[PDB]
Amino acid sequence: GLHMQAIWDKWHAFVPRTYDQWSLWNTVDKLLTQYVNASMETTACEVVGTSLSLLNKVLVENEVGDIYSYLKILGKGVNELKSSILPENLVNLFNCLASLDLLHIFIKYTTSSFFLTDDFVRFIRVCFHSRISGNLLTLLHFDFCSLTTGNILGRIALAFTSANIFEHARLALLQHFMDHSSLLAEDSSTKMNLILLQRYAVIISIFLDQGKCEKANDLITKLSLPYEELAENFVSILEACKAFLVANSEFISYTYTERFIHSLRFLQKMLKNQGMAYIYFASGMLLVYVPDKPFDPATVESLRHYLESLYKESQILEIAESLNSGKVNSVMRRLVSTEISNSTVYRSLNESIVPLYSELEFFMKSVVLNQYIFELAMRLSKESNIAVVEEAKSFVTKWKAYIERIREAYPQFVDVYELILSFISFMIYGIELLMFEAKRRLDERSQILSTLILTLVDPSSFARSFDDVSNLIEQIKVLNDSIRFEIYLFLASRLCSEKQHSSDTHSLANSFVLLANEFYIHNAKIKQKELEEVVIERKRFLQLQFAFWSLYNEIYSEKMNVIPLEQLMNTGSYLAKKIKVKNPDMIASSGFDIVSVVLMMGVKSTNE
């Protein structure tokens, strides 16, 4: 049981009411499905979809007929596009751009927005660029990598190893990211912290309406100027708890949501605080939307058969007043005549929602079971070996299966399904922060490898270390190795470049000594294999050791340090390209450092 009808009246958003309006929506959906599949020709098809957008906007203004004409014209052009590339992978980069698009779409838009904004048009261009399963959820109105730029590494892996069309699409996604430059540059998931804050603020506005303190709290909550929002977010959470006192009981997950939020608003390891506050507020608002039966903002047919009885008795009154006198009027007739003197809903002529209610009842009865929820809170406390990451994956997978079965059927209950989708999105955001922390604390050697790859590739990593050289040597011990020996040579090249600027006797000499002991152990392993393709690998290792002793002697010479930092940068770029060719695993990701400086190195990865 819940109230949930004024809540369903709180948004009660615009949607198709006429059967013809919903038919036009479905036709436009099939049209864009054929149409958003596949240069400057892509910008032309973007203008074509923009024409489709303005046309469906006119259709939303209750305009018919000429819609069917321009639709037949669009169908001719769509069969033409069906008549008039380069198979690959890592389209998850395009999905990440779509995630950033939905992020910016929620981000700058607090009031009403049909998403016609210009950057948003570029997002639509990338969305047509990137075919997706979902039926325009955003139009009607994919999150996890908020700190994980390691798929950028997969982009570097895509940059590691038709091919001209691949470099063309590389430059395409590159110019798109140059357009998506400021579209994520501000605050990785600290923006999403404010977004969950805005979702909680939406629940807070949904609490009370005309209470002047609550109206002022929702107004200031609507007054989320992002600098001032980050300034008084704590005052907002405090006043939120204060108004939560003013309401009724059972706000326990809602109260602890604010506690874990103030942590996630401030705390490192706050992915746990993020998932905790997200799951707690999601449980609060989900129980807020938890009626035991259907009562939304969603007939009077007694007037139908009533006026039918009035009219048919008026007819019978005339047919009897015939046999009374023979003129067509009566006091009975004038009486029943004076008695006969006495929006945009969906066309609901049959709404047998018992099966759809049972379908929602299974997915929310697992929630009424809540052993998923309770066991997830228990695992999200601590103590996961590895199995809870796979458990959160399987739970979100069964959730995605139920969500797909939901997005498949049920022509009715559309707004209810949309609200359930937003709620399951918040739950999956909590589950995402949780499974992310689970993979983080599960193991980190490949994450240490990813940090080393970030140490292998950044100008911040190229800023200016011998103990850190020993740390990297311990990583190489923990780390093929001849390619890692080439990486050690690249490190020695950086050492010689820093040697050029200024000279420290202890660091330079002990560093060369460390590299010498490394090469000595390498020659030891080489002679051990000699006591024992791979021979060509040993030959390449011999050529490598030849260049090593040559540059060592030249470094022990140090006659003239002609080391171009441009060539050093291209060398670090090629080392990163070899590392992108090296990495075979699918688990780790970037620890929220950069993807744009990586795109600045991705610029070199596409060029030269």
Curated annotation (Swiss-Prot):
Protein name (Swiss-Prot/TrEMBL): Midasin
Segments traversing the membrane: none
Family per record: Belongs to the midasin family.
Domain of life of the native organism: Eukaryota
Residues of the full protein shown: 2412 to 3116 of 4717
Stated role: Nuclear chaperone required for maturation and nuclear export of pre-60S ribosome subunits. Functions at successive maturation steps to remove ribosomal factors at critical transition points, first driving the exit of early pre-60S particles from the nucleolus and then driving late pre-60S particles from the nucleus.
Compartments reported by the entry: Nucleus; Nucleus, Nucleolus; Nucleus, Nucleoplasm
Subunit structure: Associates with pre-60S ribosomes in the nucleoplasm.
Annotated source species: Schizosaccharomyces pombe (strain 972 / ATCC 24843)
